[PDB]
Design a protein around this ligand. Structure first.
Ligand SMILES: *[C@@H]1O[C@H](CO)[C@@H](O[C@@H]2O[C@H](CO)[C@@H](O)[C@H](O)[C@H]2NC(C)=O)[C@H](O)[C@H]1NC(C)=O
Ligand SMILES: *[C@@H]1O[C@H](CO)[C@@H](O[C@@H]2O[C@H](CO)[C@@H](O)[C@H](O)[C@H]2NC(C)=O)[C@H](O)[C@H]1NC(C)=O
Ligand SMILES: *[C@@H]1O[C@H](CO)[C@@H](O[C@@H]2O[C@H](CO)[C@@H](O)[C@H](O)[C@H]2NC(C)=O)[C@H](O)[C@H]1NC(C)=O
Ligand SMILES: *[C@@H]1O[C@H](CO)[C@@H](O)[C@H](O)[C@H]1NC(C)=O
Ligand SMILES: *[C@@H]1O[C@H](CO)[C@@H](O)[C@H](O)[C@H]1NC(C)=O
Ligand SMILES: *[C@@H]1O[C@H](CO)[C@@H](O)[C@H](O)[C@H]1NC(C)=O
Ligand SMILES: *[C@@H]1O[C@H](CO)[C@@H](O)[C@H](O)[C@H]1NC(C)=O
Ligand SMILES: *[C@@H]1O[C@H](CO)[C@@H](O)[C@H](O)[C@H]1NC(C)=O
Lengths: 115, 87, 135, 49
């Protein structure tokens, strides 16, 4: 009722890993489930910073993490590498650049200033 | 008189202790298992290996992100009913 | 699948974990809470070689010992705890990945509908409350 | 499987209140869970529309 007719957010209940689909089959006095699941692969190191301080104010990712390879800071998802340039659309401001720990300066890119 | 080893669940006759570590087949008890293996022909007893050793590299400002994935298909089996009978 | 060693140095951004991490000083390699739990429970027999009520059972009533000695169970507990303290929840669905503890705490906060700025501004207070509760 | 290796959205399953994480310990013939939970505090009135 859970795995087949829907998608389950429970862990290890429907297969091992993140759950995608299920398929039922019949057997003598029993049932057999086929779980189609999603599992990550080879990874890379990165250097992170919990927040960004552009103009005396903190900045936080709307959805993702802040990473940097060796020269530029990017915001990405949690389960797949996809760097993008940080703009005001991907961040929300709350703070005064004095209370958080581990913040780095960098800068952001306004999308409307060029226009 | 030969190949006699005393364990925490009685002593064992007919096997030789080994200082290596393997995933064990026949559970003896008290963390001691036994199996058939070469040196070419002998039954050996040893302490089980909990698993493959590993370590992580936790640090103040280090993160790890994957760049690829994989779709997998496991399987599961469940009984649903037994045979009906009458007397 | 595997066993993860504890990090060499126990600093986690103000959080304290001495009461639950393994204690190398004790011979049993058990955490203080585990040691207190072990001492509190009074057990009768564990299948050890016997030679007064337990002695009166020479009538075919025997007690086999458990397969896993209660020393390697502590190894499993330590492995799971180290994995969940140094890798978040990603080690339960694939290869373990490192991540700083405050980031993991912020994301767990974000899970229940509280923006992470709350944590990033009240880190010290949260750490002190956690330490007091654990104490 | 659920409370430890992840975060659970089931109400009053992994501890009372909103759930944050859990830590296991082993006891003779059993297991002991330590749940870390989030609970609100003093509140204020407001007028809503
Ligand atoms: C990148 O990540 C790898 C792991 O994927 C790190 O490699 C381990 O680093 C620790 C740090 O002390 C060493 O103890 C291990 O021996 C390393 N692994 C191996 C197989 O040797 C690596 O340190 C990370 N950083 C860099 C710059 O590579
Ligand atoms: C992710 O891993 C898969 C593993 O299969 C990669 O797919 C292989 O890609 C190479 C590159 O041309 C092919 O020669 C192989 O035939 C592919 N394997 C299969 C089974 O199709 C894939 O390329 C990886 N992702 C990226 C971005 O490289
Ligand atoms: C917090 O961690 C510190 C070490 O990082 C612990 O420090 C000592 O712990 C012993 C254990 O009982 C105490 O007797 C000492 O008084 C502590 N000294 C200091 C300077 O902290 C400390 O115990 C940990 N906190 C708790 C509640 O266990
Ligand atoms: C790191 O990312 C920047 C972003 O554009 C890129 O230019 C650079 O080639 C990448 N690699 C290194 C080693 O800087
Ligand atoms: C960011 O720059 C300001 C002045 O330009 C400086 O005072 C501050 O220390 C910088 N940030 C960090 C983290 O050093
Ligand atoms: C195996 O280890 C023990 C110590 O646990 C040692 O006494 C013995 O010499 C080693 N080698 C054997 C049993 O062949
Ligand atoms: C993390 O920061 C603390 C701050 O005092 C420092 O003591 C510790 O050595 C740092 N660890 C790493 C791995 O950078
Ligand atoms: C078993 O016999 C040996 C003989 O040396 C002795 O040392 C040991 O204490 C005995 N164990 C028990 C439980 O009687």
């Amino acid at each position: 009722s859970e795995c087949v007719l829907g998608q389950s957010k429970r862990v290890d209940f429907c297969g091992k890993g993140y759950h995608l689909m299920s398929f039922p089959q019949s057997a003598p006095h029993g049932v057999v489930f086929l779980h189609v699941t999603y599992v990550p692969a080879q990874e890379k190191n990165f250097t992170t910073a919990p927040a960004i301080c552009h103009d005396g104010k903190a900045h936080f990712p709307r959805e993702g993490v802040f990473v940097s390879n060796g020269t530029h800071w990017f915001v990405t998802q949690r389960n797949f590498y996809e760097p993008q340039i940080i703009t005001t659309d991907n961040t929300f401001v709350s703070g005064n650049c004095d209370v958080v720990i581990g913040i780095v300066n960098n800068t952001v890119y306004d999308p409307l200033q060029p226009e | 008189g030969s190949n006699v080893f005393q364990t925490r669940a009685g002593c064992l006759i007919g096997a030789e202790y080994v200082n290596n570590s393997y995933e064990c087949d026949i559970p003896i008890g008290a963390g001691i298992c036994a199996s058939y293996q070469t040196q070419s022909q002998s039954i050996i007893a040893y302490t089980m290996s909990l698993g493959a050793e590993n370590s992580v590299a936790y640090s103040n400002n280090s993160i790890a992100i994957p760049t690829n994935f994989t779709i997998s298909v496991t399987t599961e089996i469940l009984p649903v009913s037994m045979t009906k009978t009458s007397v | 699948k595997q066993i993860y060693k504890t990090p060499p140095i126990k600093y986690f951004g103000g959080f304290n974990f001495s009461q639950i991490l393994p204690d190398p000083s004790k011979p049993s390699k058990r955490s203080p809470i585990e040691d207190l739990l072990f001492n509190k429970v009074t057990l009768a027999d564990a299948g050890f070689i016997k030679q007064l009520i337990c002695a009166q059972k020479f009538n075919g009533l025997t007690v086999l010992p458990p397969l896993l000695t209660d020393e390697m169970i502590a190894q499993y507990t330590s492995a799971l705890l180290a994995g969940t303290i140094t890798s978040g929840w990603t080690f339960g669905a694939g290869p373990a990945l490192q991540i700083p503890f405050p980031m993991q705490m912020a994301y767990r906060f974000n899970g229940i509908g509280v923006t992470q700025n709350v944590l990033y501004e009240n880190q010290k207070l949260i750490a002190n409350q956690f330490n007091s509760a654990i104490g």
